[PDB]
Design a binder for this molecule. Structure first.
Ligand SMILES: CCn1c(S)nnc1CNc1ccccc1Cl
Length: 134
């Protein structure tokens, strides 16, 4: 109970850095990178008991995951990878690992001031995406 309270709400993307290079490193193709890089998603996070739901709504795609911390699940990502995901809380940071085709990427979500900061890492490449309350 109360684990992710500071994450809950409706959030709007306000800045992005290095996302094209992150997407390249993940293997996303040209057209998807261009269209996806234009999107300004809203991220809606909610908690009901032990189940966390993260929805992303954008002009590119609407996605939704629900999960229990530490419990692996199947995810189809916005760029159409079929991945196996596990999300844990590490020192107040939501840590989301995706595995597919022998590859791995980690997405960290943390509260910093009034922002929700999303750090996406693939090998040596990091993208930082900043959300504010909608
Ligand atoms: C990385 C998390 N994320 C944030 S933050 N905004 N959208 C996403 C979903 N990922 C994604 C979206 C489009 C193309 C490629 C990818 Cl990997």
């Amino acid at each position: 109970s109360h684990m992710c309270d500071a994450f809950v709400g409706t959030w709007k993307l306000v800045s992005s850095e290095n996302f094209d290079d992150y997407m390249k490193e993940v293997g996303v193709g040209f057209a998807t990178r261009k269209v996806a890089g234009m999107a300004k998603p809203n991220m809606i996070i909610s908690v009901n008991g032990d189940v966390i739901t993260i929805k992303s709504e954008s002009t590119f795609k609407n996605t939704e995951i629900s999960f229990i911390l530490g419990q692996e699940f199947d995810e189809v990502t916005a760029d159409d990878r079929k991945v196996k995901s596990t999300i844990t809380l590490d020192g107040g940071v939501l840590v989301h690992v995706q595995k597919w085709d022998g590859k791995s990427t980690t997405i960290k979500r943390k509260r910093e001031d009034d922002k929700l900061v999303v750090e996406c890492v693939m090998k040596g490449v990091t993208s930082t995406r900043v959300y504010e309350r909608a």
